[PDB]
Write a protein that binds this ligand. Structure first.
Ligand code: NAP
Ligand code: CA
Length: 159
């Protein structure tokens, strides 16, 4: 099964030109726990922003161009990205906006972090109809000494 994992603020904003104006270590723990030892699919832009391969995860990068980093696997299409993952229990799509948009229709589960922040962004998580999904897990947290804003984790399974 294919799953998407994403952190969205209001209006489904997931990305902008500059660094995000929030500090959320708790989402980073969440992210790590949910993707550990599972193959991750990402678009070129996200790859560039992370800058190194994610440790203890097979890394698949989608690009129309030839790859520039032999440490990861580069694919030229959605279908090949899938095939390069092999036979695994769960494939994680970690971004970005263009990528999620193409994988949403094939995903069976979503791992979302809702952040209570209003930011100007140029990238949005695709629109989804909550009714097509079953909320299997949800858990709210207030901002604290370590997390700049309140947030909520939620796990949705396709009905
Ligand atoms: O900004 P953002 O968050 O939207 O970026 P993002 O999804 O992290 O990256 C989007 C980039 O991923 C590649 N990509 C996405 N879908 C593809 C497909 N079906 N086939 C080939 N390459 C694909 C393209 O890289 P290239 O620009 O390198 O083609 C595209 O510019
Ligand atoms: Ca922003």
């Amino acid at each position: 099964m294919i799953s998407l994992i994403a952190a969205l603020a209001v209006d489904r904003v997931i990305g902008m030109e500059n660094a995000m104006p929030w500090n959320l270590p708790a989402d980073l723990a969440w992210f790590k726990r949910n993707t550990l030892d599972k193959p991750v699919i990402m678009g070129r832009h996200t790859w560039e922003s992370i800058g190194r391969p994610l440790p203890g995860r097979k890394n698949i990068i989608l690009s129309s161009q030839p790859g520039t980093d032999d440490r990861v696997t580069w694919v030229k299409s959605v279908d090949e990205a899938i095939a390069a993952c092999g036979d695994v229990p769960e494939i994680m799509v970690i971004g970005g906006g263009r990528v999620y948009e193409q994988f949403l229709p094939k995903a069976q589960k979503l791992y979302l972090t809702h952040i209570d922040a209003e930011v100007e962004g140029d990238t949005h998580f695709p629109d989804y109809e909550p009714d097509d999904w079953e909320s299997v897990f949800s858990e709210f947290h207030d901002a604290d000494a370590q997390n700049s804003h309140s947030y909520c984790f939620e796990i949705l399974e396709r009905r």
